[PDB]
Design an enzyme around this catalytic site. Structure first.
Site, short mmCIF file in Angstrom:
data_model
loop_
_atom_site.label_atom_id
_atom_site.label_comp_id
_atom_site.label_asym_id
_atom_site.label_seq_id
_atom_site.Cartn_x
_atom_site.Cartn_y
_atom_site.Cartn_z
N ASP B 33 -50.57 -30.28 13.90
CA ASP B 33 -51.64 -29.29 14.14
C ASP B 33 -51.33 -28.33 15.32
O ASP B 33 -51.61 -27.13 15.24
CB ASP B 33 -52.98 -30.04 14.37
CG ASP B 33 -52.85 -31.17 15.42
OD1 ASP B 33 -53.04 -30.92 16.62
OD2 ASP B 33 -52.49 -32.31 15.04
N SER B 34 -50.73 -28.89 16.39
CA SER B 34 -50.50 -28.17 17.67
C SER B 34 -49.44 -27.05 17.56
O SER B 34 -49.32 -26.21 18.47
CB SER B 34 -50.08 -29.17 18.76
OG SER B 34 -51.03 -30.22 18.88
N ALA B 35 -48.68 -27.03 16.45
CA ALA B 35 -47.65 -26.01 16.19
C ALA B 35 -48.26 -24.71 15.60
O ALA B 35 -47.53 -23.81 15.17
CB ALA B 35 -46.56 -26.59 15.28
N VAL E 40 -52.80 -30.92 21.78
CA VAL E 40 -53.86 -31.18 20.79
C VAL E 40 -53.41 -32.33 19.88
O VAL E 40 -52.22 -32.49 19.59
CB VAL E 40 -54.20 -29.88 19.94
CG1 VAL E 40 -55.23 -30.17 18.83
CG2 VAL E 40 -54.73 -28.73 20.83
#
Lengths: 155, 55, 155, 55, 155, 155
Positions: B33-35, E40
């Site tokens: 998700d963080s990419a 995240v």
């Protein structure tokens, strides 16, 4: 001189809302590559409208333009309308309500409508600086008004 | 057989999930998700002088 | 290397945003005489740009027409653009992902941006129907067929 | 590809939009169908209270 | 029916809606001093209620744990629910729709709600990467073999 | 760049943001078949926190409760926190800048967040009326003394 203070008003907000909204970032994909040094231009306009007897709508047309040199960042122009019910005063005092106090009330909402479009357009959050429209009218009016004599009387 | 025709006699896939819908520490490190993010915040709110009052 | 036993294709969002907003309530003060959910109609339009190979930028422009009686209530229009990474796939499904699937990602963001501006005009609750952008182009390229063989590719 | 890897190149059927889906007298199928619902506008804000919608 | 040919398979969304929303910024103005990529972690989980007779309510609990450095940046959690008309499928796929496919529909709206609130908290926009929900459960089944890896396939 | 503006009150917005957002509809499916008349209970609770020298965070907790009796329609809350660099003032000026002025800036943002949340749970448009905090706090202040109106060649 002659200090002309505005007294004996009636002000009742019937409904505040956006009549017109405009956000532009047509340069969006490549404007994110740009060095973020925006020339953010704050412009203000006021248009009142007699809807009925002692019922006046005021519209605050706030225009914000930010440009990164030759390439524009964005445009944010919001015509924040608001139906108000004004009474008690006419003439210059009427103009002091509709042309100062009324677009002042509309400014938090004009600001926010602009701010939200900017953040949705993935630009860093833009907040318009607090404008005292009452001061803006005071300029044209006479530049003479003052109340305040805070004396501490309590035992 | 009422709302449409088709399925009525089944279980709720498992008992609830019985796995939990997320990345397990095994071999395939699937989901990242963080990419995907903007990552940008710099603003100078230009103050406009006038007088004390209210918005 | 796209020639091993791994999960099929690789997709990665880079950045999502609003390019353009418009909200016009032309009969705004008087159209509030009409207390019901206006006659709504959705109208889509789309534009794109190639920023890179394996990475494409697509814009889903969504417009809602709404009218109370014979007079327009509001016209709300968003352009939700985004940079996405489309790689691994080949043939039709490659440019189908950026052309069809990526507007479908952008549709929720465009949808809330619309309902925000509707809420600003303080008009009735506007929830847009789940419209698949693919579906219209899929029915136009339906007469073709292509039942493949059970063999998975990789990222 | 340069940015990611190698999709060769990603075009769009000669031209994107106006090929089928377009704002013109030549619309495809789908759109305006049995999906979602119109609720209301009723805020019910009487001063700083509302009511109870029973029976 | 009596075969893998689904044929008349029907999947109509009745209504999407957030049954729960949360967004917290515990260290907010202390943590804004940290300008970089928020660490995240996305943690999903599925929920539902077997109403049956082609009516299934499905909820997708989407939870974010984001942190700048060794302290929390922002937290978020949205239980994105919706009633789906599922029919015309048999075997494994029959009950598997409500536990993989129907949550995957809810994720465009789930991510949207989060990404909106992230930007409302003046944090770097967070676009949760679109993943195959089927594959998260399917990973568990492909945890016995891990061999292969051929040479560079030329043809 | 050119901040040489020296007056009474050095008010400077840094950013308006959401430290908390919440919307809980655990009764969401079942409540959509009910006659819609909730006890729309608008709450305004404001607090401040001194972070540094002349740096004050102000938060505006805006809560909307909606119940059709003992039936919960929904619950919602947005704690709109905002950093403001304020200097030059003290006493009642400071108390009112934090007490009313700053919450009034936070209110449109908090309002858009709530009504978005109500729209996300797909309840009808619930926009709260403009509540002037400076009106409410006008009763409080501290010292009851602020009259003037006397001929004076100044502003």
């Amino acid at each position: 001189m002659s200090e002309q203070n505005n007294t004996e008003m009636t002000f009742q907000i019937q409904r505040i809302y956006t009549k017109d909204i405009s956000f532009e970032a047509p340069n969006a994909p490549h404007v994110f590559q740009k060095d973020w040094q925006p020339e953010v231009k704050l412009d203000l306009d006021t248009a009142s409208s007699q809807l009925a007897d002692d019922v006046y709508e005021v519209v605050l047309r706030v225009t914000v333009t930010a440009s990164l040199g030759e390439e524009t960042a964005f445009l944010c122009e919001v015509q924040q309308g608001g139906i108000f019910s004004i009474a008690g005063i006419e003439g210059t005092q009427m103009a002091h309500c509709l042309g100062a106090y009324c677009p002042n009330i509309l400014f938090p909402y004009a600001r926010e409508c602009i701010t939200s479009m900017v953040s949705r357009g993935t630009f860093p959050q833009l907040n318009l600086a607090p404008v005292n429209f009452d001061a803006l009218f005071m300029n044209y009016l006479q530049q003479q008004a003052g109340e305040g004599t805070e004396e501490h009387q309590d035992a | 057989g009422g709302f449409f025709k088709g399925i009525d006699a089944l279980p709720l896939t498992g008992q609830y999930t019985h796995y939990a819908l997320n990345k397990k520490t095994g071999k395939p490190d699937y989901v990242t998700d963080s990419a995907a993010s903007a990552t940008a915040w710099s603003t100078g709110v230009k103050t406009y002088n006038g007088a004390l009052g209210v918005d």
